[PDB]
Amino acid sequence: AAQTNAPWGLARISSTSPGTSTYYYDESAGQGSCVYVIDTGIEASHPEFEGRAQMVKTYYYSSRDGNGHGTHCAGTVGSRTYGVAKKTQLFGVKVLDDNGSGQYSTIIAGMDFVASDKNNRNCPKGVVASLSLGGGYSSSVNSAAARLQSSGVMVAVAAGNNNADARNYSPASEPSVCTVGASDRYDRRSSFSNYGSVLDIFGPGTDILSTWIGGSTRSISGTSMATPHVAGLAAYLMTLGKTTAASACRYIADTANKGDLSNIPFGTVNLLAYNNYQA
Numbered sequence: 524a525a526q527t528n529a530p531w532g533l534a535r536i537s538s539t540s541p542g543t544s545t546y547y548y549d550e551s552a553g554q555g556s557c558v559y560v561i562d563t564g565i566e567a568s569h570p571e572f573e574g575r576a577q578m579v580k581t582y583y584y585s586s587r588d589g590n591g592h593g594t595h596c597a598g599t600v601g602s603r604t605y606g607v608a609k610k611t612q613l614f615g616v617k618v619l620d621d622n623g624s625g626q627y628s629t630i631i632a633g634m635d636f637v638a639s640d641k642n643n644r645n646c647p648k649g650v651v652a653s654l655s656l657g658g659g660y661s662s663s664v665n666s667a668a669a670r671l672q673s674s675g676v677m678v679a680v681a682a683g684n685n686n687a688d689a690r691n692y693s694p695a696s697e698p699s700v701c702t703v704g705a706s707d708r709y710d711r712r713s714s715f716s717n718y719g720s721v722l723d724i725f726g727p728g729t730d731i732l733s734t735w736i737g738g739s740t741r742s743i744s745g746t747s748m749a750t751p752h753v754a755g756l757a758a759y760l761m762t763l764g765k766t767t768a769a770s771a772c773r774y775i776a777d778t779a780n781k782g783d784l785s786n787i788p789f790g791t792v793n794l795l796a797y798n799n800y801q802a
């Protein structure tokens with residue numbers, strides 16, 4: 524299948540070179556996989572989700588996304604127009620308040636929640652969790668992210684937006700999960716993206732169009748936008764039988780576009796998420 528005039532990052536992920544505008548993907552489109560978006564929530568009524576999204580848990584007064592950040596990320600995973608995995612199932616877990624902020628004990632609780640809740644849901648092709656959040660190093664946060672991964676969920680986390688080594692941020696610094704850096708439309712590392720040996724992969728994160736609250740859309744930037752391209756891609760590959768939750772990050776790295784990016788510091792992987800689609 525082909526989506527013409529796609530957002531650039533969806534094109535980038537199905538091409539060996541930059542500058543194309545068509546997203547080429549298999550029709551299966553992540554059908555039968557599930558992605559948990561652990562964030563500010565998801566506006567599930569947005570037309571672009573087509574009834575495929577729902578809130579399953581909130582740690583605040585309401586389950587509503589009063590911010591937009593979670594809706595945007597969810598959109599890049601699995602919205603019709605803006606998503607990598609256009610037929611996946613989205614579940615929203617609200618660990619961040621409507622200012623985009625959250626305590627570490629709540630974030631941890633949210634990851635433990637997903638590990639359990641997945642056993643109650645029908646996800647025959649597998650389970651993915653997208654965590655477009657982070658702060659300073661915490662061994663407990665890293666530990667929760669490790670638990671979620673070892674549960675059998677493909678965990679994808681943002682590297683962070685400090686133009687620094689990701690080793691000092693969590694859950695970015697947990698080795699066992701899939702730590703995602705950001706690139707721009709010219710195949711440069713995004714000027715804000717963290718880097719370092721703990722990064723596993725890069726994805727598109729500068730000027731990413733996606734769904735917003737109030738039924739709208741908008742284009743924002745960050746490692747937060749790169750993470751759901753990778754989470755979506757994982758879902759899409761698992762539905763294809765190409766990989767499993769335990770090895771998806773490694774599979775994505777082994778099948779990535781190698782060496783295309785510029786401004787990658789020495790010791791950081793130069794690998795950009797790629798679907799390898801061939802009609």
Ligand SMILES: [Ca+2]
Nearest residue numbers: 539540780783
């Ligand atoms: Ca190339």
Ligand SMILES: [Ca+2]
Nearest residue numbers: 698699700723
């Ligand atoms: Ca890793």
